[PDB]
């Protein structure tokens, strides 16, 4: 509930293959940033972690996915 | 990384080297991921029929 | 109101089933329905708005005969019953489409009714929210990865539609996932008849602009300019008439929010130019925010478990694009049959639906055409453009593309030519017509050879045995192709069953009666003539005495088998004219010298007669026919409803019938002669045959009752129900199907009387589906019933939950998804059915959850005068 929906994080395939001198595009006192960020898996893993834990509960599995037979 | 060759050293030119990448052994695949992710080698013995 | 009974405490119940009872009671309460059968069959089934118009009896019936390993092959092999059903009712089971879903998918999209259709299939949801992935993922229970693939809902991905002066297409934002539907209007302003201008989107403010000349001008260059100011497209040289050319260009809101004109300037090497133009507007409209095509695409891809990638390929390769309808669904159902029946790729299944090989690549997938012909890229591509008339005959040569075609089909050149003739028997010349139609058909003949255990040369031998010889694939309809394949599905499967090669069947089914004058047959003529030297036509009955001579002379047969062998040949006529045993004798004691090959032409006719006699004995032995069975098949075919006025034909289907009858007889065993005599006459009934066949008497009786009560392709007359093979075979099929299902034939009629594309349009009521579910379920073992129950409970809770959330849940409860429903009702619905519980245990769990949420202040306002209590 607290996490809410995981975000949709589309990936870009656009790349200009710029030359190294042109690439030395810097900030001093068709994207602004030539290079792009990655997903940040550590945060995305919270949905993955909870999904597995909830899945295991729903499928009557233990913490590691092993079966269990509780009374 | 999966090959046979003679060594490139100065005293290994007559040594026959064989090598295998662990990536191609498919060891991890043997057990489900849920059993744990840290899978490390403890001991290796060599048999040469 | 739950009682604290002992049973509520210690009877183990599957979970979910309790969640379903809760939802069913709340759902029943709303709309005040009498019971849960109305909830499941009348309410859920007709509710297109929500994740699904769930049909419980449909899923019950469907799953119950998927638990039955044949996958309806049990009926396909038993046509007396399968023919009572529209093939759609069989197809609707393997392809899991409920009749309501079918009816929804079969409706066409009319743009003028998009709002009316929207409000039929959707609740009162403004498209503004419906269209966004945040809503779609909840409405259709889809992942975002899946939502991202539902793009291009237009007539194309490439060259799109234009009508009534415009184009209606979706455009998707690459970061947001936001989809808007735009209309591009093109109104010509000048020379529409000299050159065309075609503007299509490819992204927001990104358009694919094509063009086509009608009138050729020898332009030094073409310049397409927006408002005749800013060049959008520049083509050097002089582009052609009726040829489409294009470029990807940028038009921002200043370029497209107002009507603007795209001018086509054909600039000559001189200072002059020719000019054509149209007024364009690109505008976002709520009026087009429907995409009901998406609703259908999603539901179809889910029902059939198909990727939307291949699904678009399947429907667009067979019919008019930008829509879903009955014809494309028929192709999907057929595609699924082949893919479910054979271990083949969906594209293969599509070709077997009389589809072309697709030259279009998409979604990082190389085209079918290139995968088949250019993977072996032998010093250049093969193109299928009509000019590469490569000689594919046997005795011929060609360039690397001949080698490519040989490799594409992986066959010899004589085989490729035979295959080419199978595609088109009139294409006897030294060439491929070089198009997709014939290549697709060459591919079909090869595919049929591979799915069936056949060679290429066997395709012709088999088509002759089947009765489909000289059939052109270049001229075969899809209905005809499917029919052909189905005949192979019952005939090649027959050969596989009987361990016969195609040639073996072919010779068994041959009526060629090759004639010659050699000892292999002449010795048989001399043996019979000499045996009959002390014989004449009016002294003794030739069909009595010749029979023991041929019995000894030919393939070790008895004299009764030999009698029938003579009658078969007399009726079949192994000669240029009629040829009978009497003629055979008349041509041996007249224009004949024993040991002589030559006299008159009747010397070849008597040879043909002997081979014909031998051919039936070959069949007798290969088919396992009993002596009396043979006597009746051949001399008394009338009670089979067969050739009747003649001995049975050499058609493979007749031989299949003969063999199946023979096994019926082999089973009758020791009582076979009593039954066969009674069969020749009308002395047969229920119990009597059941005893001989080791069947239950009532099982056989009820099969008779249904065999006669239902109309049949093999019509059954109660008078001869047990004394005619057409009728008996029909009865046995009702026995065999009921026995496999353990339902006692009245119980299989329950499955039969269900359909989709009923030709009489007698859409079955839920009660019919429910009655079938009941009887079919009753035939399951507990080892099967348990998985049925688990399956249905899981499907059912999903259906009840989506209904509840949209229609029952009160607004005060902030329930948006299944997870919230859980928290609100204090009971889960996403749990597997495998988890067992009790009623007391769930009541405890629900209350404990309620309390935990109150104590942790998940719920907003608990009563502190209660919270502080020591408990």
């Amino acid at each position: 509930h607290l996490l809410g929906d995981k975000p949709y994080l589309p990936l870009s395939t656009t790349w200009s293959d710029p030359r190294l001198d042109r690439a030395a595009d810097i900030t001093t006192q068709t994207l602004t940033d030539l290079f792009l960020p990655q997903i940040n898996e550590v945060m995305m893993n919270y949905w993955q972690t909870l999904a597995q834990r909830v899945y295991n509960l729903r499928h009557n599995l233990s913490i590691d996915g092993q079966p269990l037979y509780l009374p | 990384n999966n090959n046979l060759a003679f060594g490139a050293g100065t005293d290994t030119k007559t040594s026959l080297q064989a090598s295998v990448s662990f990536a191609d052994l498919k060891i991890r695949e043997d057990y489900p991921a849920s059993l744990g992710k840290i899978r490390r080698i403890k001991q290796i013995s060599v048999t040469l029929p | 109101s739950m009682a604290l009974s002992q049973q509520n405490m210690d009877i183990e119940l599957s979970t979910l089933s309790l969640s379903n009872e809760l939802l069913l009671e709340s759902i029943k309460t709303e709309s005040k329905l009498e019971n849960y059968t109305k909830v499941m069959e009348m309410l859920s089934t007709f509710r297109p708005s929500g994740a699904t118009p769930y049909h419980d009896a449909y899923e019950n019936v469907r799953e119950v005969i998927q638990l039955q390993d044949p996958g309806l092959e049990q009926l396909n092999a038993s046509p007396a019953i399968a023919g009572l059903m529209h093939q759609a009712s069989l197809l609707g089971i393997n392809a899991s489409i409920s009749p309501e879903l079918f009816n929804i998918l079969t409706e066409e999209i009319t743009e003028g009714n998009a709002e009316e259709l929207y409000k039929k299939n959707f609740g009162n949801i403004e498209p503004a929210s419906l269209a966004m992935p945040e809503y779609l993922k909840r409405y259709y229970n889809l992942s975002d990865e899946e939502l991202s693939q539902f793009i291009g809902k237009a007539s194309n991905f490439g060259q799109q539609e234009y009508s009534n002066n415009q184009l209606i297409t979706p455009v998707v934002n690459s970061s947001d996932g936001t989809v808007k539907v735009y209309r591009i209007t093109r109104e010509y302003t000048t020379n529409a008849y000299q050159m065309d201008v075609e503007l299509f989107p490819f992204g927001g403010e990104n358009y694919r602009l094509d063009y086509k000349f009608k009138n050729f001008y020898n332009a030094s260059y073409l310049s397409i300019k927006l408002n005749d100011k800013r060049e959008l497209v520049r083509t050097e040289g002089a582009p052609q008439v009726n040829i489409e050319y294009s470029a990807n260009i940028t038009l921002n809101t200043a370029d497209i929010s107002q009507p603007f004109e795209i001018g086509l300037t054909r600039v000559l090497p001189s200072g002059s130019w020719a000019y054509a133009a149209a007024k364009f507007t690109v505008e976002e409209y709520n009026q087009y925010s429907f995409l009901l095509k998406l609703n259908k695409a999603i539901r179809l891809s889910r029902a059939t478990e198909l990727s939307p990638t291949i699904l678009e390929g399947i429907v667009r390769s067979v019919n008019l694009q930008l829509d879903i309808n009955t014809d494309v669904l028929g192709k999907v159902f057929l595609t699924k049959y082949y893919m479910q029946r054979y271990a083949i790729h969906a594209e293969t299944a599509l070709i077997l639906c009389n589809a072309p090989i697709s030259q279009r690549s998409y979604d990082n997938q190389p085209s079918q055409f290139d995968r088949l012909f250019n993977t072996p890229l032998l010093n250049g591509q093969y193109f299928s453009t009509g000019d590469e008339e490569i000689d594919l005959n046997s005795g011929s040569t060609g360039d690397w593309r001949k080698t490519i075609l040989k490799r594409a089909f992986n066959i010899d050149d004589v085989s490729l030519f035979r295959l080419l003739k199978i595609t088109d028997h009139d294409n006897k010349d030294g060439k491929i017509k070089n198009n997709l139609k014939n290549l697709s058909n060459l591919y079909i003949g090869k595919l049929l050879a591979d799915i069936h255990q056949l060679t290429i040369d066997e395709l012709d031998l088999l088509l002759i045995a089947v009765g489909e010889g000289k059939t052109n694939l270049s001229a075969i309809s899809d209905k005809q192709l499917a029919t052909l394949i189905r005949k192979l599905n019952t005939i090649t499967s027959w050969l596989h069953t009987q361990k016969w090669s195609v040639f073996q069947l072919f010779i068994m089914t041959s009526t060629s009666y090759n004639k010659t004058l050699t000892p292999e047959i002449k010795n048989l003529l001399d043996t019979v003539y000499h045996g009959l030297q002390g014989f004449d036509k009016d002294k003794a009955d030739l069909l009595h005495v010749m029979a023991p001579y041929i019995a000894a002379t030919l393939q070790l047969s008895s004299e009764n088998v030999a009698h029938s062998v003579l009658l078969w040949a007399d009726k079949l006529q192994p000669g240029d004219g009629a040829m009978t045993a009497e003629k055979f004798w008349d041509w041996l004691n007249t224009k004949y010298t024993p040991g002589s090959s030559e006299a008159v032409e009747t010397q070849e006719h008597i040879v043909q007669y002997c081979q014909a006699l031998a051919q039936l004995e070959m069949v007798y032995h290969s088919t396992g026919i009993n002596e009396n069975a043979f006597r009746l098949f051949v001399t008394k075919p009338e009670m089979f409803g067969a050739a009747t006025g003649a001995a049975p034909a050499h058609d493979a289907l007749s031989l299949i019938m003969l063999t199946r009858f023979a096994d019926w007889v082999n089973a009758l065993g020791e009582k076979a002669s009593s039954v066969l005599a009674a069969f020749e006459a009308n002395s047969l009934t229920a119990e009597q045959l059941a005893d001989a066949m080791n069947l239950d008497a009532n099982l056989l009786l009820q099969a008779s009752i249904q065999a006669q009560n239902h109309q049949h392709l093999p019509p059954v007359t109660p008078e001869n129900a047990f004394s005619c093979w057409t009728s008996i075979n029909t009865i046995l099929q009702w026995v065999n199907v009921a026995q496999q299902l353990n339902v006692a034939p009245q119980g299989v009629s329950a499955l039969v009387g269900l359909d989709y594309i009923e030709s009489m349009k007698e859409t079955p009521t839920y009660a019919q589906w429910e009655n079938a579910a009941g009887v079919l379920t009753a035939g399951l073992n507990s080892q099967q019933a348990n998985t049925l129950h688990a399956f249905l409970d899981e499907s059912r809770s999903a259906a009840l939950s989506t209904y509840y959330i949209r229609q029952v849940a009160k607004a005060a409860a902030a329930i948006k998804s299944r997870d919230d429903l859980y928290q609100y009702l204090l009971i889960d619905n996403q749990v597997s059915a495998a988890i067992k519980t009790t009623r007391i245990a769930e009541a405890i769990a629900s209350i404990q959850l309620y309390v935990n949420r109150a104590l942790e202040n998940v719920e907003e306002n608990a009563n502190s005068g209660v919270i502080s209590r020591q408990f």
Side-chain angles (χ1 to χ4, degrees), chain A residues 1 5-11 54 57-60, chain C residues 137 144 148 174-177 819 828 830-832 835:
Chain A
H1 181 79
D5 288 290
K6 70 182 173 65
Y8 173 69
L9 303 173
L11 303 179
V54 173
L57 287 165
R58 288 174 175 166
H59 293 80
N60 199 31
Chain C
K137 73 187 180 76
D144 51 298
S148 76
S174 66
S175 176
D176 293 345
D819 292 348
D828 199 353
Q830 293 166 69
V831 296
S832 68
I835 295 167

Side-chain angles (χ1 to χ4, degrees), chain C residues 171 184 199-209 248-252:
Chain C
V171 179
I184 300 181
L199 184 69
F200 304 89
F202 67 87
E205 300 186 17
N206 277 275
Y207 301 86
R208 181 177 60 79
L209 179 62
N248 289 321
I249 62 171
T250 299
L251 287 84
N252 67 24

Side-chain angles (χ1 to χ4, degrees), chain C residues 217-223 234-239 266-270 272:
Chain C
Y217 291 87
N218 193 15
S220 64
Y221 66 92
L222 173 70
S223 177
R234 187 182 180 95
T235 299
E236 302 294 333
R266 298 177 291 282
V267 179
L268 301 174
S270 74
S272 294

Side-chain angles (χ1 to χ4, degrees), chain C residues 643-696:
Chain C
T644 301
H650 286 213
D651 190 306
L653 291 173
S654 293
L655 272 64
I656 292 166
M657 180 277 289
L658 296 177
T659 303
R660 289 175 179 173
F661 181 83
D663 283 340
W664 172 83
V665 173
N666 289 332
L668 294 173
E670 296 82 0
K671 296 187 181 185
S673 69
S674 296
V675 172
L676 290 171
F679 175 71
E680 182 177 352
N682 294 281
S683 297
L684 295 176
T685 189
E687 185 177 0
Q688 181 187 29
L689 273 70
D691 182 67
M693 291 299 293
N694 299 315
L695 304 174
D696 182 88

Side-chain angles (χ1 to χ4, degrees), chain C residues 14 27 68-69 94 177 293 513 530 602 761 778:
Chain C
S14 297
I27 292 167
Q68 297 290 331
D69 289 346
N94 286 340
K293 295 186 283 290
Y513 304 114
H530 289 161
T602 65
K761 309 296 181 183

